[PDB]
Ligand SMILES: CN(C)c1ccc(C(N)c2ccc(N(C)C)cc2)cc1
């Protein structure tokens with residue numbers, strides 16, 4: 001399959017070179033996989049999700065995404081137009097308030113929730129969790145991410161947006177999950193992207209067009225936008241049977257575009273997520 005005039009990020013993950021505008025992907029499109037987006041919620045009624053999204057848990061008064069961030073991330077995972085895995089199903093877990101903030105205890109609860117909840121869902125091709133959030137180092141936040149990964153879920157987390165070593169941020173600093181840095185359309189490390197030896201992979205993160213609340217769309221930037229590209233790609237690869245939840249981060253790194261990125265500090269991986277699609 002091919003999507004013409006795709007958002008640049010989608011094109012980039014299906015090309016060995018920057019500058020292309022077509023997203024090439026297998027028609028299976030992540031069907032049979034499930035991705036939990038742990039964030040400010042998801043506007044499930046957005047036409048772009050085609051009824052494939054639903055809220056399963058909130059830690060606040062409502063399950064509504066009153067912010068937009070969660071809906072944007074979910075759109076990059078699995079919306080029709082802006083999504084990597086266009087037939088996956090999406091589950092929203094609202095651990096962040098409508099200001100985009102949340103306490104560590106709530107975030108931890110949301111991760112434990114997913115580890116249990118996945119046992120009540122029909123996801124024959126596997127389960128992914130996308131965490132576009134983070135804060136200062138916390139061993140208990142890292143431990144919750146490690147548990148989620150251990151339980152059989154492919155955990156993708158944002159590196160953070162402080163142009164600093166991700167070792168001082170959580171859950172980015174948890175080695176057992178897949179920590180994702182951001183790149184721009186010219187194959188440079190995004191100016192805000194964290195870096196460091198704990199990074200596993202880079203994905204498109206600068207000027208990412210996706211779904212927004214009120215049935216709208218907008219372009220925003222962050223390692224928050226890179227993470228759902230990798231989460232979507234994981235779901236896509238699991239559906240194809242190329243990898244499992246336990247080994248998906250390693251498979252993505254193994255099959256990545258290598259050495260294409262500029263402005264990568266010594267000690268940080270030069271690896272950009274790539275779907276290896278061959279028609
Ligand atoms: C410091 N830390 C762990 C962290 C910081 C920022 C973010 C992030 N999602 C973010 C930060 C800034 C902005 N802007 C627009 C300033 C957007 C997203 C995530 C983690």
Ligand SMILES: [Ca+2]
Nearest residue numbers: 016017257260
């Ligand atoms: Ca290349």
Ligand SMILES: [Ca+2]
Nearest residue numbers: 175176177200
């Ligand atoms: Ca890792």
